[PDB]
Amino acid sequence: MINIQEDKLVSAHDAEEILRFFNCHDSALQQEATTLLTQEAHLLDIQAYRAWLEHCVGSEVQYQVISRELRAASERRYKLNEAMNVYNENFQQLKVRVEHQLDPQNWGNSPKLRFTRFITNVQAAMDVNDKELLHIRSNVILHRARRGNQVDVFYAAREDKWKRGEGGVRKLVQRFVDYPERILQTHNLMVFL
Amino acid sequence: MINIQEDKLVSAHDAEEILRFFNCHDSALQQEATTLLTQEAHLLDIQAYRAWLEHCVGSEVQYQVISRELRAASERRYKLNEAMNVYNENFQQLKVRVEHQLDPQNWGNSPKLRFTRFITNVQAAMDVNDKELLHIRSNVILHRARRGNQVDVFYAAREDKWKRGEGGVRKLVQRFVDYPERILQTHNLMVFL
Amino acid sequence: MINIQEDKLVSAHDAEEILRFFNCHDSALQQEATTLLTQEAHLLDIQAYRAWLEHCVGSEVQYQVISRELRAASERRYKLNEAMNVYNENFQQLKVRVEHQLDPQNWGNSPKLRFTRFITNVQAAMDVNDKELLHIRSNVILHRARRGNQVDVFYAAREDKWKRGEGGVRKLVQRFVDYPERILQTHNLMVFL
Amino acid sequence: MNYNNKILVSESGLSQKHLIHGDEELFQHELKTIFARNWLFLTHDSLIPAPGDYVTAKMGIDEVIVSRQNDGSIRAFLNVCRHRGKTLVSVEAGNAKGFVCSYHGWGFGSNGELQSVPFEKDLYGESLNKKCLGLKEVARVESFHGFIYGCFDQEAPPLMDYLGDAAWYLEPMFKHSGGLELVGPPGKVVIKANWKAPAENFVGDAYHVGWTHASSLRSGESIFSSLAGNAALPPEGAGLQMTSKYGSGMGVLWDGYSGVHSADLVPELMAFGGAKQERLNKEIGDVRARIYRSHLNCTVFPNNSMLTCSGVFKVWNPIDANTTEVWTYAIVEKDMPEDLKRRLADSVQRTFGPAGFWESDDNDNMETASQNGKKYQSRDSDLLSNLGFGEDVYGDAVYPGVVGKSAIGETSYRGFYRAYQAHVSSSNWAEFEHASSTWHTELTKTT
Amino acid sequence: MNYNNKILVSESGLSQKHLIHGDEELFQHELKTIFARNWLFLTHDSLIPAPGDYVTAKMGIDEVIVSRQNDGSIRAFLNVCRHRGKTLVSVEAGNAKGFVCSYHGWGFGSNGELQSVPFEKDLYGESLNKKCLGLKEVARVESFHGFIYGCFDQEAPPLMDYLGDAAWYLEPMFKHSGGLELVGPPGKVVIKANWKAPAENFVGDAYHVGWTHASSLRSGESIFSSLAGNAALPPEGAGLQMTSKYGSGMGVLWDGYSGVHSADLVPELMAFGGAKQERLNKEIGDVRARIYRSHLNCTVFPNNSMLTCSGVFKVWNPIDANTTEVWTYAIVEKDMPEDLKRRLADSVQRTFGPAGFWESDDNDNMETASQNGKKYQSRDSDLLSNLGFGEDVYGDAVYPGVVGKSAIGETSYRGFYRAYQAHVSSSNWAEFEHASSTWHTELTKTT
Amino acid sequence: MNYNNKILVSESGLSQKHLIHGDEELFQHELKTIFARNWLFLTHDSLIPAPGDYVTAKMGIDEVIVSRQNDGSIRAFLNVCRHRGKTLVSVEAGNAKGFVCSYHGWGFGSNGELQSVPFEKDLYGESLNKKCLGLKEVARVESFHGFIYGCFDQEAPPLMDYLGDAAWYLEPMFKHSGGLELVGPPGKVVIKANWKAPAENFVGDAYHVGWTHASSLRSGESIFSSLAGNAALPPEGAGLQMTSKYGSGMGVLWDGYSGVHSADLVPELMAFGGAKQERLNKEIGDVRARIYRSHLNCTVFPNNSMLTCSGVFKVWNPIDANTTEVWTYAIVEKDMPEDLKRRLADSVQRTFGPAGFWESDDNDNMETASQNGKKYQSRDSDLLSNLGFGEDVYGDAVYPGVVGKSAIGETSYRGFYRAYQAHVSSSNWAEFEHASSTWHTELTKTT
Ligand code: FES
Ligand code: FES
Numbered sequence A, B, C: 001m002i003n004i005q006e007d008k009l010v011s012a013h014d015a016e017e018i019l020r021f022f023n024c025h026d027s028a029l030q031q032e033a034t035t036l037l038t039q040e041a042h043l044l045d046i047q048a049y050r051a052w053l054e055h056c057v058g059s060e061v062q063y064q065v066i067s068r069e070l071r072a073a074s075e076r077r078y079k080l081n082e083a084m085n086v087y088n089e090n091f092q093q094l095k096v097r098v099e100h101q102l103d104p105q106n107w108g109n110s111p112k113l114r115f116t117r118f119i120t121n122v123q124a125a126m127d128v129n130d131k132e133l134l135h136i137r138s139n140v141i142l143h144r145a146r147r148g149n150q151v152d153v154f155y156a157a158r159e160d161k162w163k164r165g166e167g168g169v170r171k172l173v174q175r176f177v178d179y180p181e182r183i184l185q186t187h188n189l190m191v192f193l
Numbered sequence D, E, F: 001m002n003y004n005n006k007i008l009v010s011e012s013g014l015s016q017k018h019l020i021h022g023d024e025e026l027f028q029h030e031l032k033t034i035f036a037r038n039w040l041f042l043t044h045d046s047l048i049p050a051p052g053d054y055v056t057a058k059m060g061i062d063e064v065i066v067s068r069q070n071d072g073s074i075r076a077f078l079n080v081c082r083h084r085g086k087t088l089v090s091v092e093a094g095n096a097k098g099f100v101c102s103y104h105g106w107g108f109g110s111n112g113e114l115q116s117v118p119f120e121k122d123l124y125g126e127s128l129n130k131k132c133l134g135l136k137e138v139a140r141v142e143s144f145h146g147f148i149y150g151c152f153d154q155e156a157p158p159l160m161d162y163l164g165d166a167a168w169y170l171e172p173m174f175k176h177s178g179g180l181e182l183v184g185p186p187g188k189v190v191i192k193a194n195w196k197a198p199a200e201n202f203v204g205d206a207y208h209v210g211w212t213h214a215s216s217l218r219s220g221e222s223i224f225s226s227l228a229g230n231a232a233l234p235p236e237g238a239g240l241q242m243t244s245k246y247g248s249g250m251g252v253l254w255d256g257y258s259g260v261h262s263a264d265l266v267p268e269l270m271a272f273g274g275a276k277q278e279r280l281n282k283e284i285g286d287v288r289a290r291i292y293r294s295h296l297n298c299t300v301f302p303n304n305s306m307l308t309c310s311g312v313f314k315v316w317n318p319i320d321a322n323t324t325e326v327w328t329y330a331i332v333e334k335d336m337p338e339d340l341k342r343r344l345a346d347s348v349q350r351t352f353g354p355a356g357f358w359e360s361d362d363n364d365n366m367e368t369a370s371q372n373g374k375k376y377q378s379r380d381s382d383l384l385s386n387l388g389f390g391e392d393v394y395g396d397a398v399y400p401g402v403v404g405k406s407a408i409g410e411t412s413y414r415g416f417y418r419a420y421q422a423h424v425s426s427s428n429w430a431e432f433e434h435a436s437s438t439w440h441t442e443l444t445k446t447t
């Protein structure tokens, strides 16, 4: 539907994603994706990071969260790096982050943090070429509470690719988030969106 | 169920809406409504405002968001206008707002805003008389981020009426929101709830 | 899956709950639970507290919200009361709270409060022993607006047990919430999560 | 800061120190020398027409109850209990014979009197002097054709004198039209700007319209649309600017009766205003009848603004130096058909309300200009208001006040800030008068 | 503001300037003259009974570690590392022999001593004087029947003398009952009120109960329920009010042992308290045994309050002039059955905890009264505390302190604020004493 | 507070009053004596290489536009319109020939000149003196091997002299390596700490590494990992510390070229740096070539820090005494392969960016130490920086500056705060110089 020449504020990337979900809808797949993501969020919320890696994250994963530099809507000449990687992790790198979370000398983890995630707006569509690959889009509100009166709330859209792996379990092979707040007001982005 | 003589805090309008959803539930309709609203929210989030009008909004639409004056619970004499219209738009009026969003001289839109919407608590029931008319209730959290450190979060319940239109696509014919915060603390209400 | 000896940050209680949902999934039950909770939230949002008690709350209910004292991750000697009960109510006690909400001399209720609840991440599993008992997990964001510029937002995970009662309607028999923010920054916790 | 000596506003109001939009100590000082001294908008007869009707309003950072008395007068009182200081009224409007405090139950009348105290006889006996315990009363409450203003300072000029030369310009619409009503309730929104930012913009800034509102003009479907992107400048005597002794001022855009309204209202309004003007030619003369149907962008000093014709009515309620609570009402002519009244009210909110697409164009301008006033290198910088200086007149045969006979200029900024400096550096009304004895001469220098 | 000369509290504590609940400069001054000078509640033996047990607590805006030493004593230290100033302990309670700083690893003992520094020999050699680097210690820590208080001022009176005449009223419950335990952890909630608002309410405000708590009385199912909506006033000598030299005071409601508790506890408690009273008649006399089973609403100056019988124990931790962090514990009698202990603790939280339905009735009162203290027209207004003035006595044969022999009055407000003025205008304890040499005469004037 | 006389920093920089991390009046004073006086990092050539390229940057709390001119120079201007004070540029980077104000449309060139005013001829005639209305220009803009710094004070020393003895240590990497580029855009995050907290940590705190970063060392897979949990102390001359006249300083960890990077980069980097060092031995000597491939933790006074080798580049942008906006860039060597450049940039952000696992270890330390500076009992307490005092030298034959010939110490804290005191108590650069004429003697006392 979308014509980005007319819909002036829409990026080509965003228009491509609209197209993938508006066509060919499979209700059962949407339900499967909802289950997958709800279970993922549950594992993360209880800080079962090893279980998350083992049950939800594929060996070939790319887990990426970018922060895009604010540029003019009419900008057409400045062509330098548009973004930076808050996260751009392979499986090993996620594992390092998980070990860091679990280390008994991670002083910031005592007293124990409290996480609550809200996953909504789930959409799912099979990839046209890799019949093994399932595109899942979802939005997350992530609430982190610690040390009595520190409260940080994150908001984001997630563009995921999930593929069945060993044992035929669907696992995350790509997560992409373009984080919507340019200057973070949550002390850090040390949460798994 | 509700008897507003006993349930003292409940408005007649609210009690009427409870009744419409508690009776005759159609699971398939709930799923259809979820799809409709998730797709609507996606189009809005990527700022595809023309696509939103074309694919989601009916020609006969009334899009209304009110702000109700705070009055006493026991008030029974003062009968002046109870509310004002933050939005009370027909299709043409929405179109004007969309053109305003897309105008390259809308300076407030550079750098590009970032929207993320969370749609939950979806309920759907067919209208008793107009078998073409579907009542959909849903709640929205709408996160707007701009200019590095401006973050505004809106919260509301939406009472919608959707009807199939041309090409048999279901489109919005009425949206009603009674905005819950009397004094806005988000700089403005310039978002489509 | 979870081995808490390896997944160092996971509590035994949390690991037990993962297990109950990861096994034996019934899609229809998930949908039923979603309906139940959405309808519950709707009744609460319109302040139909008597209707809520009558339609959603079982006579044998325990409605409990705790606040856990912040202790060291490595603590193994101090064994005094780990928590306190913000709520720990039986049906009669909920009824008292409902009467308090409805009393025309509850001055804090004028002008009328505005509530909006967002229920997500719904999971449902039948109890292994009491085939009458359904475990439902869900997360809530609860927005309370009053007096022009007071806005309070609550976030929590709810561990519920629901059982069919009279007329065969499923009603809440246990709600347990471990409130994630230790020091409340919402003036009070006078909302039904 | 010594406000007796500090030059916050330069001679002839030609410039202002940027810190005036950000300095919290000055904000506190304004509470005393601006808000506690001058006339502040409260409500309209149309909103509290019957005995017992009341509304709450802000006066500076204070909140008051404004109540229609049995005798038809209006009195206003601080919304604070005389016992332990609890806020008495928690609603925005209603009807009542009195107000009871939820803390210990003291009962006050709509006339502010302490009428009852629970268990008075048993607890206080005859010791309680209720006659001395009435709510703190706003000293002065006056009306301008139904628009009610309050002032805490008993020494203030009458409201009519305070409006000075601006009154002449408002009268065609406020009086000769048959009267206006205020359509409530207002929109209410907090912006991160100083109250003076919108106040100065409404009092005399037509220069920003074509550029700031380029998108709204273009998209909006309105009578002033030729201005979009500064594609075109207004004509000849397309208008004028005026200012007065006590600070109030406005721009006049001849004949723009449909104002910011969309094409779905232009024909209807242009018919309606022209028809009334025809009748007024015989009663008040052609110049004044034309003023009636001309768009006035006005600030009634300090913090009440409006766009006549467009029907926008604003209160810039001060919170702190970079926070203001914006109240937006619609004004309509009483003799308009009720369906027109309704559509006009929605159109006011549509363009300038909480989701006002025109209002949104202005926000970043107001917020950043205010916020930059806190930044170290900008505090002592000069905000310029010299456009048109040396071309203003005083004592014109037709148009009163200090007047710039051009649609676009900064005349009204200079008068607003000439009055503002005089107040900030004065301890009372007498001192303000002493500081203002040559106000027009100061404004018209070099002419 | 010159606190030496400013009359914040009028003679005999009859009124207070409203600004005391909103002025931030005064808040900072209270940190020095109220919080750094007086006795502040820390914890209870029951919460740190074993060697190594500790809790963190606030003392004013400061945070301290309160630790049970090996020898059975309790010492308290600022929760701040002596090296670069990092907060040492991030938890609320625990058991440990020492505390290691997460920044550079310095190790302090439970006795505050600097015990180890990583790589001491290699980095500092013998240059580090650890003996001078112990945690900053709270000068004074004392117990009242297991309730532990701290004071930063070594010049303070002993805690017992500080309680003055209030001690006599607390002893039946705190001592003769066999002792109380504190049930933790506390509820914790931030309210937008000044700390003095709840403190004054608990120290001597029975007047608000019937009206403020109308809904809770009616719905609640409690012994004081006849008061709902001021439907009825307490009887004869239904009670009394008292105040003391150092500011502490309370109301006494005879025989109300079940307090705010719901009917699901009234019979059980009324049996239990009556049974104990019977035994105490022989040990402490009938008047004191009755005081034991009478509801006391008390503030231990400055910011610790409680309702005996009801079992509510509060700390109003100051954050800023319009922000307070409220800690709520339950107090129970040690010899109560453990199932009763549990139910009573839940009932305390049920009524006065974070989701306390009675507590909720009070919030708007406390918040708006505090916030109005910032509003320009209210800063210099007078909050009244004259109810019962001229009927108080001193030196009664049976009931000590400045006493008002009536259940409802403002006696305790006057004594609280007589002490508060004396502190705010004094530079040290000696000056406070000089300013208080005629305290009771001042409170009983006109009688 | 009298900053002329107040001893905020003790002699030889041995201790600092804790209030320096929390006092807002001092923060405002730093805006004048630290931020408006000293050199502040703006950008890098690599980020604005072509004519018209610009970025916005903070200088203290002010925001500036930093623009590449047609002639190849860089000029910087306050991001504030000369008319009514609106923020001119709302983006972070771009390319443009000028900037138009969205309020009234005034157009400024990339050179800051006011070039156009809408309807100039019709409104202003010839009255507008545009030549006097250019954007407020940053007086001084200079480069250190592509790194661009600004200073509002025309009286400042040239940047090179300002770097003093630190320049010698930076040159191998900044110059002799062939040059560095800055990889943007930066991460941006607000932390609740004073800007001095991270600044002091980066300038000379190696002591915290093994304990604060225990988890990151252990998990991280990096060259410095032997330090985890203080399991081991660095060797012999594992490094040194240095400080300079104008405040800049750094730690040197010999040979640690792979820095904080994960094993997925250690072999590649250790090869690359060793290869370059081999070539540099012949050009700059073995000591300096080794410095090139040695990890430097440096703060360029006041608020710019970096870890060479690791490639971390930080700006601690001040917001208020307990709020700082942290900007994080990556630095890479220009002659690195572009795939290595990419991976290194991601690794910098991976460890020290917004979701930097090492950075996260430091946050609580920085936040609580800063926040404790507001707490009443801690304001007048002394933060200690005496480690290594009496062992520093000046004028060494090989290593310049005030130098501590050990890897772990507080030498650089003492020099940072010796300069900070001198600035806070001085009204201008001349006074700073007068206060610094014996700077090294002061730092090396007792040696
Ligand atoms: S504060 Fe109003 S009756 Fe006491
Ligand atoms: S700040 Fe505690 S060891 Fe350094």
Ligand code: FES
Pocket: F081, F082, F083, F084, F085, F086, F101, F102, F103, F104, F105, F106
């Ligand atoms: S404020 Fe920039 S053109 Fe007027």
Ligand SMILES: [Fe+3]
Pocket: D201, D208, D209, D212, D213, D362
């Ligand atoms: Fe405008």
Ligand SMILES: [Fe+3]
Pocket: E201, E208, E209, E212, E213, E362
């Ligand atoms: Fe109370």
Ligand SMILES: [Fe+3]
Pocket: F201, F208, F209, F212, F213, F362
């Ligand atoms: Fe570090």
